[PDB]
Design a protein around this ligand. Structure first.
Ligand SMILES: CO[C@H]1/C=C/O[C@@]2(C)Oc3c(C)c(O)c4c(c3C2=O)C2=NC3(CCN(CC(C)C)CC3)NC2=C(NC(=O)/C(C)=C\C=C\[C@H](C)[C@H](O)[C@@H](C)[C@@H](O)[C@@H](C)[C@H](OC(C)=O)[C@@H]1C)C4=O
Ligand SMILES: [Mg+2]
Ligand SMILES: [Mg+2]
Ligand SMILES: [Mg+2]
Ligand SMILES: [Mg+2]
Ligand SMILES: [Mg+2]
Ligand SMILES: [Mg+2]
Ligand SMILES: [Mg+2]
Ligand SMILES: [Mg+2]
Ligand SMILES: [Mg+2]
Ligand SMILES: [Mg+2]
Ligand SMILES: [Mg+2]
Ligand SMILES: [Mg+2]
Ligand SMILES: [Mg+2]
Ligand SMILES: [Mg+2]
Ligand SMILES: [Mg+2]
Ligand SMILES: [Mg+2]
Ligand SMILES: [Mg+2]
Ligand SMILES: [Mg+2]
Ligand SMILES: [Mg+2]
Ligand SMILES: [Mg+2]
Ligand SMILES: [Mg+2]
Ligand SMILES: [Mg+2]
Ligand SMILES: [Mg+2]
Ligand SMILES: [Mg+2]
Ligand SMILES: [Mg+2]
Ligand SMILES: [Mg+2]
Ligand SMILES: [Mg+2]
Ligand SMILES: [Mg+2]
Ligand SMILES: [Mg+2]
Ligand SMILES: [Mg+2]
Ligand SMILES: [Mg+2]
Ligand SMILES: [Mg+2]
Ligand SMILES: [Mg+2]
Ligand SMILES: [Mg+2]
Ligand SMILES: [Mg+2]
Ligand SMILES: [Mg+2]
Ligand SMILES: [Mg+2]
Ligand SMILES: [Mg+2]
Ligand SMILES: [Mg+2]
Ligand SMILES: [Mg+2]
Ligand SMILES: [Mg+2]
Ligand SMILES: [Mg+2]
Ligand SMILES: [Mg+2]
Ligand SMILES: [Mg+2]
Ligand SMILES: [Mg+2]
Ligand SMILES: [Mg+2]
Ligand SMILES: [Mg+2]
Ligand SMILES: [Mg+2]
Ligand SMILES: [Mg+2]
Ligand SMILES: [Mg+2]
Ligand SMILES: [Mg+2]
Ligand SMILES: [Mg+2]
Ligand SMILES: [Mg+2]
Ligand SMILES: [Mg+2]
Ligand SMILES: [Mg+2]
Ligand SMILES: [Mg+2]
Ligand SMILES: [Mg+2]
Ligand SMILES: [Mg+2]
Ligand SMILES: [Mg+2]
Ligand SMILES: [Mg+2]
Ligand SMILES: [Mg+2]
Ligand SMILES: [Mg+2]
Ligand SMILES: [Mg+2]
Ligand SMILES: [Mg+2]
Ligand SMILES: [Mg+2]
Ligand SMILES: [Mg+2]
Ligand SMILES: [Mg+2]
Ligand SMILES: [Mg+2]
Ligand SMILES: [Mg+2]
Ligand SMILES: [Mg+2]
Ligand SMILES: [Mg+2]
Ligand SMILES: [Mg+2]
Ligand SMILES: [Mg+2]
Ligand SMILES: [Mg+2]
Ligand SMILES: [Mg+2]
Ligand SMILES: [Mg+2]
Ligand SMILES: [Mg+2]
Ligand SMILES: [Mg+2]
Ligand SMILES: [Mg+2]
Ligand SMILES: [Mg+2]
Ligand SMILES: [Mg+2]
Ligand SMILES: [Mg+2]
Ligand SMILES: [Mg+2]
Ligand SMILES: [Mg+2]
Ligand SMILES: [Mg+2]
Ligand SMILES: [Mg+2]
Ligand SMILES: [Mg+2]
Ligand SMILES: [Mg+2]
Ligand SMILES: [Mg+2]
Ligand SMILES: [Mg+2]
Ligand SMILES: [Mg+2]
Ligand SMILES: [Mg+2]
Ligand SMILES: [Mg+2]
Ligand SMILES: [Mg+2]
Ligand SMILES: [Mg+2]
Ligand SMILES: [Mg+2]
Ligand SMILES: [Mg+2]
Ligand SMILES: [Mg+2]
Ligand SMILES: [Mg+2]
Ligand SMILES: [Mg+2]
Ligand SMILES: [Mg+2]
Ligand SMILES: [Mg+2]
Ligand SMILES: [Mg+2]
Ligand SMILES: [Mg+2]
Ligand SMILES: [Mg+2]
Ligand SMILES: [Mg+2]
Ligand SMILES: [Mg+2]
Ligand SMILES: [Mg+2]
Ligand SMILES: [Mg+2]
Ligand SMILES: [Mg+2]
Ligand SMILES: [Mg+2]
Ligand SMILES: [Mg+2]
Ligand SMILES: [Mg+2]
Ligand SMILES: [Mg+2]
Ligand SMILES: [Mg+2]
Ligand SMILES: [Mg+2]
Ligand SMILES: [Mg+2]
Ligand SMILES: [Mg+2]
Ligand SMILES: [Mg+2]
Ligand SMILES: [Mg+2]
Ligand SMILES: [Mg+2]
Ligand SMILES: [Mg+2]
Ligand SMILES: [Mg+2]
Ligand SMILES: [Mg+2]
Ligand SMILES: [Mg+2]
Ligand SMILES: [Mg+2]
Ligand SMILES: [Mg+2]
Ligand SMILES: [Mg+2]
Ligand SMILES: [Mg+2]
Ligand SMILES: [Mg+2]
Ligand SMILES: [Mg+2]
Ligand SMILES: [Mg+2]
Ligand SMILES: [Zn+2]
Lengths: 229, 37, 621, 243, 95, 340, 229
């Protein structure tokens, strides 16, 4: 095609690794870069459902504000480090997976120390959970779920074991989104929108992939306007 | 309507020349040529 | 009259970068006509000059190919923009033109401070550097984004003006709401639980005065930096809320907004740690904290890298300001409940002064001077009253933050809206006996108005005078001072002046440390005549003392180790016509040593001629 | 000729707020209210504290009332409307605004509730009252909730809006930007002169000379004193050279 | 702002000197032909209607872009005044 | 002293007729002497506006009189002050000379009034340029009106009360530069003189005596009075104002209409409905935007242009002469000698 | 379908005439009513096409600033009233339709007075064009086109007849958009978004039609994320 349709969004991509991915697309009519970038953003953060530590149970610990002997870190610092943990399950059959880990004595507890689960993978192995001295006994069960957005530990209140403590839900492979709408000049008219959105990702998925998922959720939602009533 | 005594019109910099290493060897060749017979 | 000149109305250019300026293509055409003509011939648009001329003699005849030619001619050239009174050298600055439609001239907000140019119709001229030389200087030593620090003070002039602060401030402020039941979590574990549920209930706020951690800190803890903001986005935490966060190696109890500002800078200049070292996230960002940030950034990271930070601040400041929804409202100007008190109390007391006169005790005059004293005090009383009001009850009152933030507002002004403007003078100068009981919030009466009018005219009649007088001065100064120019080798005559860090008389005789400012003024960027060993460091001879150094000497005089400072100065120079590097000092508009050939004479004469417009003007002698 | 408003033009209310149009925004993304009606002009707050004319902020409030109540008023010089009377009409306005909203079939937004949260934490709405009641309070204050338009999210914190009268100011002949390349020249003084169709050069005053003097603008100043204005043989060879 | 203006400022004894250098370099860059440059190959001057800045947009934006590299030499009296213009015409074509 | 009419809009052209100056005959206050004259003297009350005057070297010397200010027999602005015998206030008014005003104890109009009775024991009055809290028994005279204190041009401001006298000036001079818009609108909030301005200025066309309308042209409204007479009222269709602003009289009355004496037949250049109307009430949010409104910048909604809201008609008057040169008369013909 | 998919956006519609049209759709997850309502709004105002008077030719009138005898209104007031006129053609075959009207004497000229055209309809019949007295001769030809957005009379400069005068183009058929996101309670969880957007239209197109065009522009745009580079 040649005139109005060939003059079409030149989708250009720049991605390094699975974390960063810039995406440019121009020309666009008046105030459309915004019209597109904004929704995609709102989707890219909430919708690309993900995984986050939803609950924790240290065996001798009762409340979240306690400290474990032989363990430098305090319960609150550890439950915090767990929010840093990124896991990845392969299929719907895995809604809530409880990862288990128990380590004793003079060893450093990293995420690779959790007993492997069949359909689940840990992308954050070397992450640091704790530093055990001597006579250091840490046996815990950390829940993991698939959800969307941010869910305060107060909102869900998970109950696996009565002495367990819920954690805040960081549900997203997407770290941050960012879009800029700068003018571009195409021959005749100057007023032009150039939309470029930068997406960052924990590694689980890729910027491109994410973006694709995003647009679909929008598309799928635009279809929901079918049957009047 | 003369250049200003103060500024880039400074007796300290009114005169400054620039060179390319290529034009540096070119001028020394002019000096080499000075050797008669 | 210059041959390649122009002049039109100006208009704020928010996205524009300090570097550039919006110039009407229509103007650019005429301005850069000859440069365009030739460029037409180099392309197919025209056969020759005379052709290229007639091709443009009419407006309807321009092919869109011409714009593309001019836009190509202007590639890396820059122009000069002038303002109405050119009071100092920054009165003319160079920028890269970014051609735009229409009639107006797009100017950057940051330099609206250098040119005293607001947008109520102020028009700016524009000139063109024709020689490759004039262009070289123009964009090297005259370009805006290069001359960031003032020649008057080593203080930045690229300070976030009104809107940017307002933005940057609102984002970093923390809130405090209701203190009812116990504020003690520092100690009990039943204190964490009870005031955590109590907060979930309706009694304890998320921001309560509870030393260690208000339950707002108890409820939310954020692991990585980002985590913090995401919760903000989801509607969990406002930006001004008090939360805890884990940064590089510290559990820091700082708000969302504060944490975000941190990034803004950390991002502007990617040396993230160096970004933290020069920032104070322990307070709301006032123009001063910002000003400071700028300076530091300039000395620390380097000139252009600063420029980036500048626009970065400009951008978010602008954005955040829009969303903050700060607005002016009538009920926002809040009058204190104490106003009625202070009034009546001072009211009855006036009655006493009267009874005291009705009897014959106080002379005709005594009465008068006693009444004025009554109000002068009472008025100042309402003033600190309104602020205390806002300070304790409404921390986020519109009218307030603007004034607190380096943004907009004068203490005396606020007083006229919320408290009351109290004493206006008669025609001559004898202040009136009766005050202006009213504020602007409520009806300034029919006559308390006419009364205030008088003093208005005098201010206006005066302004009309410094317009041509501030010049009276600068003229004189430049007539004497022009010849002075930095042309040297370190002038060998070491005759020096000693800067006093102490003054003998505020109160008869008591030796006291001079103001942190006056001192700065004296030793900033000077050249030590002789060596000085003070707090432990050995300031060498001839070294240029940085503001950091002049901060040491004061800390030392505080301790009691030096009462004077040996330093080179213009007052003692040997170069007949001229002053040298070591005797002038630091301050070029840049913060390094002065550069040989700077026209100091005028630079000086100017810094002095402008502020003069602010000084009172009753009678010369 | 017809003069449609544009970016170069200057408008100003009777109070004194003067100012120029800097950007004409597409109705698409400027601040829009809950009910689709958007704002025409967005005035900066900062221009109000320094100057001292709250009278405009008072006008906009009575205005908001007249908008929903479909009525105009007459507030005399110093005897006119009073702060309580306005809050009263605002109260009447809340019913036309939000009353139709009740019956038309819908309640309050996640957005509307969100800005209320931040508004109570601010101190504009009595904590513990229902959003419906809270918004009445917040409206009476003269501000209402506004969504971005560009993002559709709300603008954290109520913002005032209303019917303010604004005039457009006459464009003087100077307005017509004067851009001159080359042109006539005076007979006795040889400096650039305009008139009828050639624009006439700008004046380079001493105050401006010094500005350059201060910089190291040596040539740039010579130029202004030679090539550009008085060097008869200079400006000629100047043009041709450029050509 | 402009590329490594700091770096530039640092390479001179005086601020006002750097301006004279750049300006005189830009002069020669045009006069003797614009290919009188020292850094054209791989990463060089560039404009975008095409990548056509490689030919003749801004003179000194080049001068600066070269001076920032360590190939040029600016002295008080480096090469005798009139012999310089002679050797430069001899070696650089394009007229 | 004789100046071009200030017809930017009737309002402006009107004030221009009621402006007083210092400089002039040369014999009176010239250029030199100033600050004592330029200041707003005490007596300037109801006689001269204190806001009105310009801004600059020429300040306070040129100012327009006040609302009820009137030149009696010999150019002495007498401001109206109503009489108050005892604690009784009258509807009678005395136009007092500057001098005589000092011999009495005068009070402001803000004084709570029940009619003829003053209502508060300690109520403000001002003897001679001095603010004095006097008693109801001392109040000899009272201020006639809140309007007389200032000028017309100023009186048009809504809540003048809450605005800094300094910036209120700006507002007053701003109106003097108001340009007539094809679409005119009165303020959503007015002071009360909009009507009186248009009427006393000669913008709108009013009906002499009661009757009915005959023809309603776009050029003429021939009304028929009940007296058995009918007159044709032409309407300045499109005229050229000295400063280039349109002056059109748009008929507001339909065909066959019984008119009350003194009712608008047509609206002036800038009147909506017999009310002064400049600019146009617009819904406005008062917040910050990116930088588009930074020091004193205004962001506008395209929507304001969609509707022909802020639009104004101009008219410049180009003129050329056929001169007689000794070289040969300059002919004016379609002939343009050289190219197309 | 029964559980999560049957629990689907119930698209309900309420439309009276071609001007007003309300559109409700719930339930929606967290913060999606906004995610959808806002973009659609941005589109509904800028993106959609309509009709507007593009040119006018009074027969004895030469310039726009003239006044016609026997005609109260002036040319400028009338050309203004025409912008108020809303027409509706039925098919692409009608790009530029010239409506004709000539009326004389003591009659009021309304839009219904235009001679009918086969595929075109006037929704604005009672609109007031002018008041003619006696000896009032008004014969004109008003052009009409199909376009998008706002186009200043200066930008197009239409040339039917040399003495004709162009008019400003008021092409958005959409008058105003408005959307509300009120909570809805569906069994288990209360946090629910209910998006309902109210659209108004000049009559050229219908609220529903508009909305449909809108969503498509979005869809079409979401596809432009196809070919990386
Ligand atoms: C008797 O005609 C001239 C006498 C000059 O001689 C002088 C020495 O005597 C004056 C006398 C006795 C005056 O009362 C005034 C001025 C001058 C003189 O300067 C003014 N001068 C200025 C001050 C600053 N200059 C700029 C200069 C520095 C380059 C411009 C004018 N404003 C002036 C006024 N304004 C105002 O009050 C204001 C605040 C606004 C009104 C504006 C409208 C638009 C005008 O009214 C317009 C319709 C027109 O009347 C004038 C433009 C007129 O010109 C003609 C051709 O008619 C002169 C008044 C005056 O009332
Ligand atoms: Mg197209
Ligand atoms: Mg890669
Ligand atoms: Mg990969
Ligand atoms: Mg990476
Ligand atoms: Mg990265
Ligand atoms: Mg936009
Ligand atoms: Mg968003
Ligand atoms: Mg996953
Ligand atoms: Mg226990
Ligand atoms: Mg063990
Ligand atoms: Mg071990
Ligand atoms: Mg790995
Ligand atoms: Mg260990
Ligand atoms: Mg379990
Ligand atoms: Mg993000
Ligand atoms: Mg951006
Ligand atoms: Mg934007
Ligand atoms: Mg997909
Ligand atoms: Mg699919
Ligand atoms: Mg249907
Ligand atoms: Mg030179
Ligand atoms: Mg060389
Ligand atoms: Mg040889
Ligand atoms: Mg030999
Ligand atoms: Mg040999
Ligand atoms: Mg920008
Ligand atoms: Mg811009
Ligand atoms: Mg030709
Ligand atoms: Mg053109
Ligand atoms: Mg090209
Ligand atoms: Mg102006
Ligand atoms: Mg000016
Ligand atoms: Mg040159
Ligand atoms: Mg200096
Ligand atoms: Mg400031
Ligand atoms: Mg608070
Ligand atoms: Mg209490
Ligand atoms: Mg509470
Ligand atoms: Mg820590
Ligand atoms: Mg780097
Ligand atoms: Mg600290
Ligand atoms: Mg400061
Ligand atoms: Mg530095
Ligand atoms: Mg009170
Ligand atoms: Mg009381
Ligand atoms: Mg009391
Ligand atoms: Mg006391
Ligand atoms: Mg005081
Ligand atoms: Mg006090
Ligand atoms: Mg309190
Ligand atoms: Mg505070
Ligand atoms: Mg407040
Ligand atoms: Mg001040
Ligand atoms: Mg005096
Ligand atoms: Mg005296
Ligand atoms: Mg009052
Ligand atoms: Mg003087
Ligand atoms: Mg001066
Ligand atoms: Mg002087
Ligand atoms: Mg030495
Ligand atoms: Mg010595
Ligand atoms: Mg002293
Ligand atoms: Mg003291
Ligand atoms: Mg002090
Ligand atoms: Mg020694
Ligand atoms: Mg010693
Ligand atoms: Mg120390
Ligand atoms: Mg020591
Ligand atoms: Mg030593
Ligand atoms: Mg030394
Ligand atoms: Mg130091
Ligand atoms: Mg100290
Ligand atoms: Mg101390
Ligand atoms: Mg100096
Ligand atoms: Mg100043
Ligand atoms: Mg003083
Ligand atoms: Mg126009
Ligand atoms: Mg509606
Ligand atoms: Mg209504
Ligand atoms: Mg009234
Ligand atoms: Mg009521
Ligand atoms: Mg109802
Ligand atoms: Mg309805
Ligand atoms: Mg209902
Ligand atoms: Mg807050
Ligand atoms: Mg309630
Ligand atoms: Mg021109
Ligand atoms: Mg010209
Ligand atoms: Mg010429
Ligand atoms: Mg020459
Ligand atoms: Mg170095
Ligand atoms: Mg040296
Ligand atoms: Mg390069
Ligand atoms: Mg091209
Ligand atoms: Mg190429
Ligand atoms: Mg090529
Ligand atoms: Mg040769
Ligand atoms: Mg004298
Ligand atoms: Mg005196
Ligand atoms: Mg007085
Ligand atoms: Mg005036
Ligand atoms: Mg007496
Ligand atoms: Mg009483
Ligand atoms: Mg008196
Ligand atoms: Mg005043
Ligand atoms: Mg009449
Ligand atoms: Mg009849
Ligand atoms: Mg009647
Ligand atoms: Mg409106
Ligand atoms: Mg002649
Ligand atoms: Mg021919
Ligand atoms: Mg239906
Ligand atoms: Mg129905
Ligand atoms: Mg209906
Ligand atoms: Mg949301
Ligand atoms: Mg005929
Ligand atoms: Mg006509
Ligand atoms: Mg219209
Ligand atoms: Mg169609
Ligand atoms: Mg089709
Ligand atoms: Mg006939
Ligand atoms: Mg007829
Ligand atoms: Mg339409
Ligand atoms: Mg609407
Ligand atoms: Mg509507
Ligand atoms: Mg259900
Ligand atoms: Mg239930
Ligand atoms: Mg469509
Ligand atoms: Mg498709
Ligand atoms: Mg492909
Ligand atoms: Mg590629
Ligand atoms: Mg690539
Ligand atoms: Zn020296």
């Amino acid at each position: 095609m040649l005139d109005s349709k060939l003059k079409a969004p030149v989708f250009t991509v720049r991605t390094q690794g699975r974390e960063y991915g810039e995406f440019v697309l121009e020309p666009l009519e008046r105030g459309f870069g915004v019209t597109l970038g904004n929704p995609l953003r709102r989707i890219l953060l909430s919708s690309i459902p993900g995984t986050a530590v939803t609950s924790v149970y240290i065996e001798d610990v009762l409340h979240e504000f306690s400290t474990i002997p032989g363990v430098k870190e305090d319960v609150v610092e550890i439950i915090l480090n767990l929010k840093e943990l990124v896991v990845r399950f392969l299929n719907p059959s895995l809604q809530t997976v409880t990862l288990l880990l128990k380590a004793e004595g003079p060893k450093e507890v990293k995420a690779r120390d959790f007993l492997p689960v069949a359909d689940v993978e840990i992308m954050n192995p070397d992450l640091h959970i704790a530093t055990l001295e001597e006579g250091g006994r840490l046996n815990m069960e950390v829940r993991v779920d698939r959800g969307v957005g941010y869910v305060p530990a107060e909102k869900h209140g998970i109950k696996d074991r009565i002495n367990a403590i819920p954690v805040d839900a960081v549900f997203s492979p997407v770290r941050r989104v960012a879009f800029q709408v700068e003018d571009t000049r195409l021959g005749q008219r100057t007023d032009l929108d150039k939309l470029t959105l930068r997406i960052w990702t924990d590694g689980s998925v890729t910027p491109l992939e994410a973006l694709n998922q995003a647009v679909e959720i929008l598309r799928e939602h635009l279809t929901y306007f079918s049957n009047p009533q | 309507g003369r250049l200003i005594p103060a500024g880039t019109g400074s007796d300290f910099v009114r005169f400054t020349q620039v060179v390319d290493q290529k034009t540096l060897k070119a001028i020394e060749e002019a000096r080499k040529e000075a050797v008669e017979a | 009259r210059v041959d390649y000149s122009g002049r039109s109305v100006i208009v704020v250019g928010p996205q524009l970068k300090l570097h550039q300026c919006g110039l009407p293509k229509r103007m650019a055409l005429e301005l850069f006509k000859p440069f365009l003509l030739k460029k037409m011939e180099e392309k197919g648009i025209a056969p020759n000059v005379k052709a290229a001329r007639r091709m443009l003699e009419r407006q309807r005849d321009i092919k869109d190919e011409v714009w593309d030619a001019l836009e190509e001619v202007i590639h890396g050239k820059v122009v000069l923009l002038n303002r109405a009174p050119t009071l100092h050298r920054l009165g003319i600055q160079a920028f890269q033109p970014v051609l735009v439609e229409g009639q107006s001239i797009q100017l950057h907000p940051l330099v609206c401070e250098a040119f005293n140019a607001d947008f109520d119709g102020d028009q700016m001229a524009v000139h063109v550097p024709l020689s490759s030389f004039a262009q070289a200087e123009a964009r090297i030593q005259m370009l805006s984004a290069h001359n960031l620090l003032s020649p008057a003070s080593g203080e930045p002039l690229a300070k976030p003006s009104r809107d940017i602060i307002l933005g940057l401030y609102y984002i970093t402020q923390v809130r405090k709401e209701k203190k009812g039941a116990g504020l003690e979590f520092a100690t009990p574990e039943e204190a964490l639980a009870a005031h955590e549920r109590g907060e979930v209930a309706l009694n304890a706020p998320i921001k309560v005065a509870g030393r260690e951690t208000s339950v707002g800190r108890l409820k939310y803890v954020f692991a990585n930096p980002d985590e913090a903001l995401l919760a903000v986005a989801h509607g969990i935490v406002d930006l001004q809320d008090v939360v805890t966060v884990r940064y590089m190696g510290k559990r820091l109890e700082t708000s969302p907004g504060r944490i975000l500002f941190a990034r803004i800078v950390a991002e502007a200049v990617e040396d993230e740690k160096v970004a933290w070292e020069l920032i104070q996230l322990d307070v709301p960002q006032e123009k001063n904290s910002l000003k400071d940030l700028v300076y530091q950034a300039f000395l620390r990271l380097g000139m252009e890298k600063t420029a980036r930070l500048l626009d970065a601040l400009k951008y978010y400041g602008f954005t955040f300001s829009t969303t903050s929804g700060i607005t002016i409202g009538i009920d926002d100007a809040v009058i204190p409940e104490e106003k009625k008190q202070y009034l009546e109390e001072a009211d009855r007391k006036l009655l006493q002064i009267e009874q005291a006169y009705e009897m014959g005790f106080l002379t005709d005059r005594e009465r008068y001077d006693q009444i004025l004293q009554l109000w002068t005090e009472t008025t100042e009383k309402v003033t600190q009253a309104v602020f205390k009001n806002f300070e304790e009850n409404y921390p986020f009152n519109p009218l307030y933050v603007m004034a607190q933030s380096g943004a907009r507002g004068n203490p005396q002004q606020i007083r006229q809206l919320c408290g009351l403007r109290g004493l206006m003078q008669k025609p001559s100068g004898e202040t009136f006996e009766v005050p202006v009981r009213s504020s602007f919030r409520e009806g300034l009466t029919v006559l308390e108005y006419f009364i205030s009018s008088h003093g208005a005219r005098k201010g206006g009649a005066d302004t009309a005078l410094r317009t041509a007088d501030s010049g009276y001065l600068t003229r004189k100064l430049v007539d004497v001072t022009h010849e002075i120019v930095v042309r040297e080798a370190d002038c060998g005559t070491t005759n020096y002046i000693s800067v006093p860090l102490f003054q003998p008389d505020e109160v008869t005789r008591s030796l006291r440390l001079r103001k942190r400012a006056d001192i700065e003024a004296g030793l900033y960027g000077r050249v030590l005549a002789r060596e000085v060993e003070v707090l432990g460091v050995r300031l060498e001879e001839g070294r240029y003392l940085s503001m950091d150094d002049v901060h040491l000497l004061i800390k030392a005089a505080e301790a009691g180790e030096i009462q004077e400072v040996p330093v080179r100065s213009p007052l003692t120079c040997q170069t007949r016509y001229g002053v040298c590097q070591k005797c002038y000092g630091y301050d070029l508009s840049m913060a390094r040593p002065v550069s040989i050939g700077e026209a100091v004479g005028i630079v000086a004469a100017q810094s002095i001629g402008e502020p003069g417009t602010q000084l009172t003007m009753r009678t010369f002698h | 000729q017809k003069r449609k408003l544009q970016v170069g033009d200057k408008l100003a209310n009777r109070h004194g707020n003067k100012g120029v149009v800097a950007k004409i925004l597409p109705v698409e993304d400027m601040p829009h209210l809950p009910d689709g009606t958007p704002v025409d002009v967005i005035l900066n707050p900062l221009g109000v504290p320094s100057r001292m004319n709250l009278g405009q902020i008072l006008e906009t409030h009575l205005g908001l009332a007249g908008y929903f109540l479909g009525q105009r008023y007459i507030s005399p010089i110093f005897d006119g409307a009073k702060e309580p009377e306005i809050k009263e009409l605002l109260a009447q306005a809340f019913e036309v605004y939000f009353g139709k909203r009740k019956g038309e079939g819908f309640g309050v937004d996640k957005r509307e509730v969100e800005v209320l949260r931040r508004a109570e934490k601010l101190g504009l709405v009595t904590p513990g009252k229902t959003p419906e009641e809270q918004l009445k309070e917040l409206f009476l204050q003269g501000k209402v909730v506004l969504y971005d338009g560009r993002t559709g999210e709300p603008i954290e914190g109520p913002i005032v809006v209303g019917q303010m009268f604004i005039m457009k100011l006459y464009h003087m002949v100077e307005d017509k930007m004067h851009a001159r390349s080359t042109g006539p020249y005076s007979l006795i003084t040889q400096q650039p002169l305009g008139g009828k169709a050639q624009f006439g050069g700008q004046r380079f005053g001493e105050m401006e000379v010094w500005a350059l003097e201060a910089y190291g603008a040596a040539h740039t100043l010579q130029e202004m004193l030679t090539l550009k204005s008085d060097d008869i043989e200079g400006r000629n060879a100047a043009y041709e050279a450029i050509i | 702002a402009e590329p490594g203006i700091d770096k530039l400022f640092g390479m001179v004894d005086s601020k006002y000197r750097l301006t004279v250098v750049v300006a005189k370099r830009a002069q020669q860059l045009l006069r003797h032909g614009f290919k009188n440059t020292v850094l054209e190959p791989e990463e060089r001057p560039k404009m975008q209607t095409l990548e056509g800045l490689f030919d003749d947009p801004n003179a000194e934006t080049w001068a600066m872009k070269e001076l920032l590299t360590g190939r040029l030499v600016f002295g008080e009296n480096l090469v005798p005044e009139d012999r310089l213009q002679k050797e430069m015409e001899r070696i650089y074509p394009g007229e | 002293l004789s100046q071009f009419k200030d017809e930017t809009n009737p309002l402006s052209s009107l004030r221009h007729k009621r402006r007083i100056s210092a400089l002039g005959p040369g014999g009176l206050t010239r250029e030199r002497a100033g600050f004592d004259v330029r200041d707003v003297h005490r007596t300037h009350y109801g006689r001269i506006c204190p806001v009105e005057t310009p801004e600059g070297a020429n300040i306070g010397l040129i100012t327009s009189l006040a609302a009820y200010a009137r030149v009696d027999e010999l150019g002495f602005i007498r401001t109206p002050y109503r009489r108050v015998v005892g604690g009784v206030v009258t509807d009678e008014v005395v136009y007092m000379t500057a001098t005589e005003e000092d011999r009495y104890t005068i009070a402001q109009a803000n004084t709570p009034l029940e009619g003829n009775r003053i209502a508060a024991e300690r109520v403000v009055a001002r003897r001679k340029g001095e603010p004095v809290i006097v008693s109801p028994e001392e109040v000899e005279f009272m201020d006639v009106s809140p309007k007389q204190v200032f000028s017309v041009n100023t009186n048009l401001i809504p809540f003048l009360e809450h605005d800094d006298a300094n910036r209120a000036l700006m507002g007053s001079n701003m109106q003097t530069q108001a340009v007539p818009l094809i679409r005119a609108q009165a303020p959503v909030v007015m002071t009360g003189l909009e009507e009186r301005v248009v009427r006393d200025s000669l913008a709108a066309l009013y009906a002499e005596e009661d009757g009915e309308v005959a023809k309603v042209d776009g050029n003429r409204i021939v009304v028929r009075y009940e007296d058995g007479r009918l007159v044709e009222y032409p309407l300045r269709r499109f005229y050229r104002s000295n400063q280039g602003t349109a002056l059109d009289q748009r008929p507001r009355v339909v065909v066959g209409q019984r008119v009350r004496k003194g009712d608008l037949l047509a609206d002036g250049p800038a009147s909506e409905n017999g009310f002064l109307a400049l600019g146009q009430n617009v819904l406005v949010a008062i917040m910050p935007f990116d930088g588009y409104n930074f020091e004193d910048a205004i962001v506008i909604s395209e929507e304001l242009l969609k509707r022909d809201f802020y639009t104004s008609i101009h008219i410049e008057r180009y003129e050329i002469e056929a001169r007689d040169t000794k070289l040969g008369p300059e002919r004016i013909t379609r002939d343009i000698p050289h190219l197309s």
